[PDB]
Amino acid sequence: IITNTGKVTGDEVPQLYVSLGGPDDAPKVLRGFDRITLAPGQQYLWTTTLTRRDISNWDPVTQNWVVTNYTKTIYVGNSSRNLPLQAPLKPYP
Amino acid sequence: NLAYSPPFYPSPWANGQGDWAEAYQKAVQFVSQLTLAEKVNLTTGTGWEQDRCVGQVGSIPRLGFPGLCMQDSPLGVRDTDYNSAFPAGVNVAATWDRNLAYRRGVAMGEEHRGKGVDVQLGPVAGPLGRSPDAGRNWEGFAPDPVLTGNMMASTIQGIQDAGVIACAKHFILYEQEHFRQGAQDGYDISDSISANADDKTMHELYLWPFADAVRAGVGSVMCSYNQVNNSYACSNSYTMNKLLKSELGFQGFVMTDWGGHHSGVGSALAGLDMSMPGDIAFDSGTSFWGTNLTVAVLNGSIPEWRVDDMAVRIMSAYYKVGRDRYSVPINFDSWTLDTYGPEHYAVGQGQTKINEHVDVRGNHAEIIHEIGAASAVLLKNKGGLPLTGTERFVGVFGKDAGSNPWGVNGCSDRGCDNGTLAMGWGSGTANFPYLVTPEQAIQREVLSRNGTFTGITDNGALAEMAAAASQADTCLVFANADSGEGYITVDGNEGDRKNLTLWQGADQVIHNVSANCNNTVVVLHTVGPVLIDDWYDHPNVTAILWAGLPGQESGNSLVDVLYGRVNPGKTPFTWGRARDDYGAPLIVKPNNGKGAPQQDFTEGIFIDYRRFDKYNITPIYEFGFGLSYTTFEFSQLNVQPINAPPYTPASGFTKAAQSFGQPSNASDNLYPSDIERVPLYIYPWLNSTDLKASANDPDYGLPTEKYVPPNATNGDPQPIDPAGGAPGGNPSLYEPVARVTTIITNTGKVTGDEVPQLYVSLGGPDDAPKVLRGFDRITLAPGQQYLWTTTLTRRDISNWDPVTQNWVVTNYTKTIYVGNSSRNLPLQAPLKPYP
Amino acid sequence: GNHAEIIHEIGAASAVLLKNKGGLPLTGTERFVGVFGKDAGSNPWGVNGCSDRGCDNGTLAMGWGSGTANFPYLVTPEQAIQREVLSRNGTFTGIT
Amino acid sequence: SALAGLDMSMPGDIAFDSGTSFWGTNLTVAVLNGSIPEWRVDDMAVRIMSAYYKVGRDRYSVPINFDSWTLDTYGPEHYAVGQGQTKINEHVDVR
Amino acid sequence: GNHAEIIHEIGAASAVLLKNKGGLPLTGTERFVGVFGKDAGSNPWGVNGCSDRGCDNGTLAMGWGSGTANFPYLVTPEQAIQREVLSRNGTFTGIT
Ligand SMILES: *[C@@H]1O[C@H](CO)[C@@H](O[C@@H]2O[C@H](CO)[C@@H](O[C@@H]3O[C@H](CO[C@H]4O[C@H](CO[C@H]5O[C@H](CO)[C@@H](O)[C@H](O)[C@@H]5O[C@H]5O[C@H](CO)[C@@H](O)[C@H](O)[C@@H]5O)[C@@H](O)[C@H](O)[C@@H]4O)[C@@H](O)[C@H](O[C@H]4O[C@H](CO)[C@@H](O)[C@H](O)[C@@H]4O[C@H]4O[C@H](CO)[C@@H](O)[C@H](O)[C@@H]4O[C@H]4O[C@H](CO)[C@@H](O)[C@H](O)[C@@H]4O)[C@@H]3O)[C@H](O)[C@H]2NC(C)=O)[C@H](O)[C@H]1NC(C)=O
Ligand SMILES: *[C@@H]1O[C@H](CO)[C@@H](O[C@@H]2O[C@H](CO)[C@@H](O[C@@H]3O[C@H](CO[C@H]4O[C@H](CO[C@H]5O[C@H](CO)[C@@H](O)[C@H](O)[C@@H]5O[C@H]5O[C@H](CO)[C@@H](O)[C@H](O)[C@@H]5O)[C@@H](O)[C@H](O[C@H]5O[C@H](CO)[C@@H](O)[C@H](O)[C@@H]5O)[C@@H]4O)[C@@H](O)[C@H](O[C@H]4O[C@H](CO)[C@@H](O)[C@H](O)[C@@H]4O[C@H]4O[C@H](CO)[C@@H](O)[C@H](O)[C@@H]4O)[C@@H]3O)[C@H](O)[C@H]2NC(C)=O)[C@H](O)[C@H]1NC(C)=O
Ligand SMILES: *[C@@H]1O[C@H](CO)[C@@H](O[C@@H]2O[C@H](CO)[C@@H](O[C@@H]3O[C@H](CO[C@H]4O[C@H](CO)[C@@H](O)[C@H](O)[C@@H]4O)[C@@H](O)[C@H](O[C@H]4O[C@H](CO)[C@@H](O)[C@H](O)[C@@H]4O[C@H]4O[C@H](CO)[C@@H](O)[C@H](O)[C@@H]4O[C@H]4O[C@H](CO)[C@@H](O)[C@H](O)[C@@H]4O)[C@@H]3O)[C@H](O)[C@H]2NC(C)=O)[C@H](O)[C@H]1NC(C)=O
Ligand SMILES: *[C@@H]1O[C@H](CO)[C@@H](O[C@@H]2O[C@H](CO)[C@@H](O[C@@H]3O[C@H](CO)[C@@H](O)[C@H](O[C@H]4O[C@H](CO)[C@@H](O)[C@H](O)[C@@H]4O[C@H]4O[C@H](CO)[C@@H](O)[C@H](O)[C@@H]4O)[C@@H]3O)[C@H](O)[C@H]2NC(C)=O)[C@H](O)[C@H]1NC(C)=O
Ligand SMILES: *[C@@H]1O[C@H](CO)[C@@H](O[C@@H]2O[C@H](CO)[C@@H](O[C@@H]3O[C@H](CO)[C@@H](O)[C@H](O[C@H]4O[C@H](CO)[C@@H](O)[C@H](O)[C@@H]4O)[C@@H]3O)[C@H](O)[C@H]2NC(C)=O)[C@H](O)[C@H]1NC(C)=O
Ligand SMILES: *[C@@H]1O[C@H](CO)[C@@H](O[C@@H]2O[C@H](CO)[C@@H](O[C@@H]3O[C@H](CO)[C@@H](O)[C@H](O[C@H]4O[C@H](CO)[C@@H](O)[C@H](O)[C@@H]4O)[C@@H]3O)[C@H](O)[C@H]2NC(C)=O)[C@H](O)[C@H]1NC(C)=O
Ligand SMILES: *[C@@H]1O[C@H](CO)[C@@H](O[C@@H]2O[C@H](CO)[C@@H](O[C@@H]3O[C@H](CO[C@H]4O[C@H](CO)[C@@H](O)[C@H](O)[C@@H]4O)[C@@H](O)[C@H](O)[C@@H]3O)[C@H](O)[C@H]2NC(C)=O)[C@H](O)[C@H]1NC(C)=O
Ligand SMILES: *[C@@H]1O[C@H](CO)[C@@H](O[C@@H]2O[C@H](CO)[C@@H](O[C@@H]3O[C@H](CO)[C@@H](O)[C@H](O)[C@@H]3O)[C@H](O)[C@H]2NC(C)=O)[C@H](O)[C@H]1NC(C)=O
Ligand SMILES: *[C@@H]1O[C@H](CO)[C@@H](O[C@@H]2O[C@H](CO)[C@@H](O)[C@H](O)[C@H]2NC(C)=O)[C@H](O)[C@H]1NC(C)=O
Ligand SMILES: *[C@@H]1O[C@H](CO)[C@@H](O)[C@H](O)[C@H]1NC(C)=O
Ligand SMILES: *[C@@H]1O[C@H](CO)[C@@H](O)[C@H](O)[C@H]1NC(C)=O
Ligand SMILES: *[C@@H]1O[C@H](CO)[C@@H](O)[C@H](O)[C@H]1NC(C)=O
Ligand SMILES: *[C@@H]1O[C@H](CO)[C@@H](O)[C@H](O)[C@H]1NC(C)=O
Ligand SMILES: OC[C@H]1O[C@@H](O)[C@H](O)[C@@H](O)[C@@H]1O
């Protein structure tokens, strides 16, 4: 949820970064974004769907895309460093 | 003896193909999560005046879904405030400019979006324009399937690009107001008028602009009030299952016109998706759907796949245009402008904040102004226009020049003609933020250049007019003609116009000013054509300008044309000498005893210019005609055949129908205890697990075979229609067959606009001598040359063959005509077969 | 000539504010401005339509008789308030 | 390059106005002498025309109405060698 | 105050058409207008950038010395003509 906490209508660019988890991976990588207009005090539920590719690495050995064993962490916010909310991706039950 | 509408079943289910694939997938994923009761909520409106929008289906609170809001109209947001009032569709048609149509669409969708509206109830392809005097033709575009079809597509794209579902209406053969909901004028008739047309006439005329709508991505279609071969349009399996969903491949949803719904099971199986406003009659507390549709699925009378397809089609439209991306809650109320009031307006309950007074107009005044100006049509000009700006004394004459004394929004649904005319009456309206009159704007312009001015708006004051006309340099005379939806009657005009002549006593005003002023310029604000034979050729009328219904900037857009700053369009309808010249008289008296009146489209394709052309009737001004402030010449016609792959009829089979959830039990469809049941409010729930008692239907209990036609419940793979295969029809119909190039040259002194027009003679004995198949709008400086290139499709040179139930290129030779009106076509060439 | 300028200046400066509890000046941020009354509007017989201005058919800008002159035009309260209101993005209705 | 997956050579010569091409006449000869299978060049042509038909050039085609080398209304078609005088700019407003 | 208006009206009325065989008036629909000359443009040092206007660095609207005044702004020929040409969808270029 994204809420306009100010006094005027405004545009936000919510962003979704993923940490793939491995020791050679980048701390995080952009995998989602949108641009929304919200009036004052308005809420928006922002829904993004990640794909297999968005949580894979390229493995030279098998010459294919793999989801490594490392825990993937999803971060949400409005720049590459303003990421107040985070959560791990768990297996489906 | 009595026209019959054959059955076609089952109701085609949505196929997830082509441009609809992403939206279908999201719809499925959404509807897959739903209970039966939640699914029924998407289908059924909550009752007349029970929520905030003109139409509103229920919510799905378990998933945080607020429902959908359906709001009028085709020319702006109806029944609110701080919105714009756009020009009428007939003016858009008169521009002959697709990109202006597009831009108006974006602008309208933007206002709907900012008010929280999900579906905008337009644009209008039906009425097409069968009869010049039918009351709602101004809401639509033109009596020509190509012109209207192109404007539908452009308009729909605009709307839907702005994040709002469009709704093509009224489907179909809704071509007059009298008897559209049956009994009126003291006549007792059992049922609405019935439009009876043959399969070719349906295909070559009325349905064609719907195919364009569907091909353009239109998210919804509204079925009409009238019957079609004596089955109600919202109950007609041939029009909704066969024509719209099978042949045209429509992948969105079909809603009822308001009170157009006539059955629960029949209508659902005959292809209907949404019931508006959701009750049987306004505030009856009863619905053919709602509780009844919950029961009809529970008791096996309607397959689960069908109520799933209604929901999947509804959410497909929603996802297709991006409704999940534009979060604006409903911030207005259609019933009152009060800030506070009842949510449930019909029963005075649930007091809350119902209008936020949000201003959605932005810079939309600019596209309204442009369309206003470009849409004006200069029918006559002997030097009277353009005005120089330095006339010493300017007279403005006629009530149509000035304002409504009751305020711009003073008469509900614009049901009056008390001044200048910028919009007809009925549901097809919006409230104005202001209206700039011709009087206001002309006075400002004349005074900007120190001219003197008088405005005489009492059409009774003939001595005063004569005297001032004796003294003025240029007399500007204004006259109008009004019409609208049939629930409103203005001076004996019950929606439909009771004649084709001028309103407000303007004829006499034209006569006395002409007599005294040798530089009289007449301006017409008419919903369509009027008979002008008695004054148009008067030597003192030095120009005639049709300005239609220009919306809120009427007079500002008018002065741009008058002073030559913006160039005029072309008439999108015929101006004939006499009424009888149009044919297709209105049925204003019952012609079937006490049964549904019978409107036979005996004329076939022969309406407006096709009729005039066929019978050699000479109009005063022909379809596609208009003068420019310069001259144009047409040269070097070249028709180049393309080696089209031969026509491939479609074949193969649909997927089998699917159910997205597990079957529901009556036990899970009871009113939840925590719900306070609003009186007359339409809900999906059952009083009890006793299905008969919860439906409360006098006729409850028959097995399907006894009241429903064969194959209505067939969920197995179906034959793909040979004329279908994709939205708009078989893709092989849209294969290019010819490339037409022609040179247009501005041979005059001033810059101007031309509307080049391409007409095709299909060539057979029963074809029209020429039908429009292409147009554009170009601006040329003096001496400038332009090569106009049009690519003709197979559909463009085909006829509908009832025998083979497909489109066919006949053996008769086709002739391409190129020029700037339906009768000024100096260049022609046969369409040759590819070597 | 340029005599409009003096007519305007006398028009303005001759106006008398008898009562004012808060209602004037207008701020230029009004969202919906209504104009009410036949005296805000035009004479429908035209500006010089009644001999010697011998009538009261719209806004009153001059009494009747020999103490009169013909108008080159007459800008009404309705026309001008509409213009000012629209130029500040306001909505407007005139009921006359 | 043909066998390595290239489909179109732009601007077509080896060097600018060199009069020589790695394809052109060379590609004709390469196919005729067996060095390049017919399926390869056929696949070059198919892939080119697949793009053309994908976006609907067959629907939206209009003749070229401008010239990249000069704004003059009249000039040479074959700008590089001052040849083939004709109307090369129609000055069409596409804005 | 509103003295811009008299300045504008005198500006215009003071212009002298010395020669004309077709070039004036402009139609307001020319497709490409070129403006040429350092006299069409701005003083790059600002409108009041030379003491007592003691320079000729752009368009000339006033001579130098005590017979001068500071400008609130100066609408140049380039500025106004570009705005007018573009208002009628013409193209434009200014070479100063
Ligand atoms: C098709 O469908 C449409 C839509 O439904 C439909 O539209 C309707 O058309 C109607 C017909 O045109 C139309 O009604 C006409 O309206 C005319 C204007 O109405 C307004 O003004 C009048 C007159 O006001 C004058 O006069 C009165 C005094 O009587 C005074 O009080 C006023 O202040 C004002 O004064 C001025 O004139 C004085 C002298 O008269 C002068 O002394 C003053 O100094 C000053 O100059 C008001 O009374 C109204 O209330 C409106 O405000 C209206 O003029 C016209 O009336 C005439 O015709 C009617 C028949 O249609 C008669 O009932 C009526 O008595 C009038 O009859 C005279 O004129 C006709 C022809 O014009 C003539 O044949 C008559 O014999 C008679 O002649 C005498 O007078 C004329 C001039 O008036 C002289 O020249 C002669 O020599 C004679 O002396 C209509 O009433 C209606 O508005 C419109 N409806 C809508 C909603 O749009 C249309 O009808 C349909 N078409 C068809 C073909 O069916
Ligand atoms: C599960 O729960 C369900 C939810 O409650 C529940 O549904 C209800 O079922 C009952 C039956 O049990 C339904 O009542 C019937 O409705 C029929 C249809 O009425 C409407 O449509 C008529 C036109 O219908 C044609 O077109 C439809 C598609 O539009 C087709 O489905 C139809 O089959 C029919 O097709 C024919 O015509 C087509 C051209 O139009 C053509 O393509 C096709 O090939 C074929 O020729 C309308 O005329 C009708 O309107 C009339 O009546 C209403 C009032 O009802 C008025 O307002 C109108 O002005 C007008 O006069 C509807 O819009 C009815 O036909 C059927 O009526 C017959 O039977 C009842 C007696 O029970 C008689 O009162 C009536 O006079 C009729 O008699 C005729 O047929 C009988 C045979 O039964 C025969 O004896 C007699 O001689 C005579 O000719 C009946 O009213 C009800 O609609 C459903 N309700 C809801 C809410 O959906 C279901 O029962 C439950 N199931 C179980 C198992 O429990
Ligand atoms: C309002 O009322 C009007 C008047 O009723 C409606 O207009 C009618 O609409 C009908 C469609 O619903 C249409 O029906 C067709 O008629 C054709 C021939 O009719 C001729 O006679 C009449 C009357 O005597 C004339 O007035 C008319 O002008 C004609 O001269 C038939 O050829 C059509 O049959 C085919 O389609 C129907 C369904 O539409 C199928 O049931 C039927 O099986 C036929 O289809 C097969 O055969 C054709 C033969 O050429 C094939 O081309 C086709 O693809 C199919 O082929 C399969 O089967 C064959 C073996 O048969 C096999 O070899 C092949 O491989 C395939 O598997 C049809 O009956 C009326 O003509 C039309 N009337 C008029 C005057 O317009 C109007 O729509 C109503 N409107 C509404 C909204 O309700
Ligand atoms: C089909 O469409 C219709 C029409 O939209 C839907 O009907 C509406 O359903 C909603 C949700 O049930 C309902 O809203 C409730 O109105 C109640 C009656 O006045 C309110 O009492 C209730 O408020 C409570 O819940 C809110 C959140 O749900 C809380 O924020 C609030 O404080 C209240 O919470 C108290 O009570 C709840 C139990 O109700 C309890 O759990 C809490 O702890 C707390 O004590 C709702 O806002 C509308 O009234 C309905 N509209 C009408 C006209 O009746 C219908 O739901 C749709 N059908 C389906 C199947 O989806
Ligand atoms: C489901 O859909 C069906 C329509 O297919 C819909 O049927 C309507 O139900 C009402 C209520 O049973 C019917 O009302 C009848 O109307 C006639 C009108 O002249 C009256 O004679 C009857 O009156 C008696 O019964 C009432 C019962 O509530 C009493 O209150 C009253 O005093 C009388 O004793 C009766 O009202 C109506 O005719 C049908 N309509 C049709 C076209 O069949 C049903 O209402 C829908 N269900 C839901 C839950 O919405
Ligand atoms: C087919 O493709 C081949 C390449 O795969 C292409 O080969 C090129 O041909 C030209 C000759 O036609 C070669 O150019 C020569 O280069 C040598 C340098 O080593 C020069 O000696 C040659 O003479 C130049 O200088 C002379 C001075 O007297 C001049 O008289 C003369 O005109 C020349 O300017 C000449 O330039 C070139 O080396 C090859 N290129 C490669 C990369 O192998 C062949 O031309 C193509 N065929 C067609 C029909 O296009
Ligand atoms: C502003 O527009 C209004 C709406 O058009 C105008 O009001 C209308 O004015 C005409 C002429 O005065 C009236 O027509 C008369 O009607 C009577 C009887 O009608 C009665 O029945 C209807 C219901 O069907 C009812 O609504 C009415 O109140 C009446 O009781 C006829 O016998 C006369 O011959 C004549 O035709 C309209 O009735 C009236 N309509 C409304 C909705 O008020 C008004 O004149 C316009 N004002 C200006 C300044 O132009
Ligand atoms: C804007 O206008 C100012 C003032 O006219 C310009 O500055 C002036 O530029 C001229 C030419 O470069 C200078 O001339 C110089 O005179 C000295 C003698 O004092 C001589 O030795 C130099 O070789 C040269 O001829 C002039 O002094 C100078 N004046 C001032 C007050 O600074 C300036 O160039 C203009 N700028 C633009 C961007 O157009
Ligand atoms: C066309 O307009 C002229 C006015 O410009 C009309 O001429 C006047 O007509 C009346 C009535 O016959 C004469 O008494 C006047 O002397 C004429 N005025 C002038 C200034 O010449 C002329 O009659 C109009 N034509 C028609 C057919 O009505
Ligand atoms: C207006 O013209 C009519 C004829 O159409 C005539 O009978 C009448 O006297 C004229 N009235 C005036 C005031 O000129
Ligand atoms: C539902 O039950 C109430 C009584 O609780 C009754 O008044 C109403 O008529 C019933 N509704 C139907 C549709 O039978
Ligand atoms: C139902 O459709 C099938 C074709 O799938 C056909 O065999 C059958 O004749 C139809 N049934 C009736 C009763 O018309
Ligand atoms: C209008 O009149 C005023 C005063 O004479 C004058 O300043 C202005 O230039 C005039 N305008 C025109 C276009 O003649
Ligand atoms: O108000 C919603 C609907 O109302 C009906 O009365 C009209 O015929 C429709 O065109 C309109 O969209």
Chain B residue with the nearest C-alpha to that of D94: B778
Is residue B724 within 8 A of residue B248, CB to CB? The reply is: yes
Task: Give chain C's radius of gyration (CA, Å).
Answer: 15
Domain with CATH 3.20.20.300 in chain B: 1-325
Biggest CA–CA distance in chain D, Å, is 49
Whether D61 sits inside 8 A of B791 (CB atoms) is yes
Alpha-carbon dihedral angle through residues B288, B294, B300, B303, given to the nearest 10 degrees: 90
Q: Is D92 on the interface with E (CB under 8 A)?
A: no
- Say how far apart CA C81 and CA C60 lie, in whole Å: 16
What are the structure tokens assigned to B729, written together?
A: 């029809």
Which among B73, B154, B156 is positioned nearest to B120, based on CA atoms? B73
User: A12 CB near a chain B CB, below 8 Å?
Assistant: no
Q: Which CATH number fits domain B1-325: 3.30.1360.70, 3.40.190.10, 3.40.50.2000, 3.20.20.300?
A: 3.20.20.300
C-beta B681 within 6 A of ligand 4: yes
| Six-digit token string for B275 | 């019931």
Whose CA is closest to B469, among B403, B522, B418?
A: B522
CA distances from B137 to B147, B170, B425, B497 (A): 14, 11, 12, 11
CA distances (Å), D19 to each of D11, D13, D68, in order?
12, 7, 20
Does residue C30 come out as left (phi exceeding 0), alpha (psi in the -120 to 50 range) or beta? beta
Residues whose CB falls within 8 Å of the CB of residue B386, separated by 6 or more in sequence, listed in order: B562, B563, B564, B629
| Residue B47 to residue B41: CA distance in whole angstroms | 12
The residues pairing with A14 across neighbouring beta strands, listed in sequence order, are none
Q: Is D93 on the interface with E (CB under 8 A)?
A: yes
Q: Which two tokens stand for residue B118?
A: 């999900």
Q: What's the gap in Å between the CA of E86 and the closest CA on chain D?
A: 12
Give the span between the Cα atoms of D21 and D12, in whole angstroms: 6
Choose from B751, B784, B793, B796 for mutation: most chain D CBs within 10 A. Answer: B784
Chain centroid to Cα E47, Å, comes to: 13
Contact between B274 and B260 under an 8 Å Cβ cutoff? The reply is no
Query: B192-216: b or e for each residue (b if 16 or more CB lie within 10 Å)?
Result: bbbbbbbeebbbbbbbbbbbbbbbb
B515 alpha carbon to ligand 9 midpoint, in Å?
6
CA D66 to chain CA centroid, Å, is 16
Q: Helices (DSSP H) in B85-204: which residue ranges?
A: 89-95, 98-114, 145-161, 199-201
DSSP state of A62: T
Atom 89 of ligand 2 has which residue's CA nearest to it?
B707
Nearest CA in chain C to B465: C45
For chain C, list the strands marked E by DSSP. Answer: 32-36, 91-95
Give me ligand 4 centre to Cα B344, in Å.
15
**Cα B305 versus chain centre, distance:** 31
Residues of D in contact with E89 (CB under 8 A): 95
How far is B560 from E75, CA to CA, in rounded Å? 26
Within chain B, all domains assigned CATH 3.40.50.1700 are found at 361-631
In sequence order, which ranges of B579-732 are alpha helices (DSSP H)? 608-614, 691-695
Interchain contact, A45 vs B327, CB within 8 Å: yes
Chains with 3+ CB–CB pairs under 8 A to B are: A, C, D, E
* The token pair that represents E59 in the structure block: 């368009």
Cα distance between residue E96 and residue E76, in whole Å:
12
Chain A contact partners (≥3 CB pairs within 8 A): B
Is A81 exposed, middle or buried (CB count within 10 Å of its CB: 0-12, 13-18, 19+)?
exposed
Is residue E85 within 8 A of residue E92, CB to CB? The reply is yes
Cis peptide before B66 (omega within 30 of 0): no
Mutate to test the pocket of ligand 11, among B288, B687, B696 (most ligand atoms within 8 A of CB): B687
Which one, of B60, B57, B35, B54, lies nearest residue B46 by Cα?
B57
One-letter amino acid for residue B706 of the chain: K
Atom of ligand 5 nearest to the CA of B292: 1
Asked if the peptide bond before residue B170 counts as cis, ω within 30 degrees of 0, the response is yes
Experimental method: X-ray
Q: Which pairing describes strands B231-232 and E32-36: parallel, antiparallel, or unpaired?
A: unpaired
> What residue's CA is closest to ligand 8, atom 35?
E57
Is residue B99 less than 8 Å (CB to CB) from chain D? Answer: no
Kindly identify the ligand whose nearest atom is closest to the C-alpha of E52.
8
Concatenate the DSSP letters of all residues of B318-364 into one string: HHHHTTTT--------SS---SEEEEEGGGTEEEEE--------TTT
Taking the CA of residue E19 and the nearest CA in chain D, the distance in Å comes to: 30
- Contact with chain B for residue E19, Cβ under 8 A: no
- Ligand 5, closest atom to CA B694? 49
Q: How far apart are CA B498 and CA B481, in angstroms?
A: 11
Ligand 8 binding pocket includes E46 (Cβ within 6 Å)? no
Burial B702-714, CB ≥16 within 10 A → b, else e: eeeeeebeeebbe
What's the CATH superfamily of B361-631?
Answer: Glycoside hydrolase family 3 C-terminal domain (3.40.50.1700)
C-alpha B593/C-alpha B589 separation (Å) is 10
User: Beta-strand (E) ranges in B334-488?
Assistant: 340-344, 349-353, 377-381, 393-397, 452-456, 474-481
What is the torsion angle, in degrees rounded to the nearest 10, for the CA atoms of residue D49, residue D50, residue D55 and residue D60? 30
Let me know if A67 is exposed, middle or buried by CB neighbors in 10 A (0-12, 13-18, 19+). middle
Probe site for chain B from C5, C51, C73 (most B CB atoms < 10 A)? C73
Give the separation between CA B177 and CA B127, rounded to whole angstroms.
Answer: 10
User: Kind and range of the H or E element at B605?
Assistant: none
- Give contacts of D 22-61 with E, CB under 8 A: none
- Other residues' Cβ atoms within 10 Å of the Cβ of residue B236: 31
Other Cβ atoms within 10 Å of B788 Cβ, number: 19
d(CA C26, CA B549): 33
Q: Is B359 on the interface with A (CB under 8 A)?
A: no
Ligand nearest, relative to CA of residue D9 = 6
Q: What's the rounded Cα separation, in Å, for the pair B527 and B518?
A: 28
How far CA B596 is from CA of B4, B281, B392, B484, B599, in Å, comes to 13, 19, 61, 22, 9
Radius of gyration of chain A (CA): 16
- B90, B548 contact by CB (below 8 A): yes
> Starting at the edge strand that comes first in sequence, how are the strands of the sheet with B815-819 ordered?
B771-775, B757-761, B815-819, B827-830
Residue B368: what are its φ and ψ, rounded to 5°?
-65, -45
User: Residue D58 and residue B642: Cβ atoms within 8 Å?
Assistant: yes
Token reading at E90: 């013409």
Q: Inspect the structure and tell me whether chains D and C have 3 or more CB pairs less than 8 Å apart.
A: no
Ligand 2 mutation target, pool B236, B238, B263, B692, most atoms within 8 A of CB: B263
- Min Cα–Cα distance to chain E from B783, Å: 12
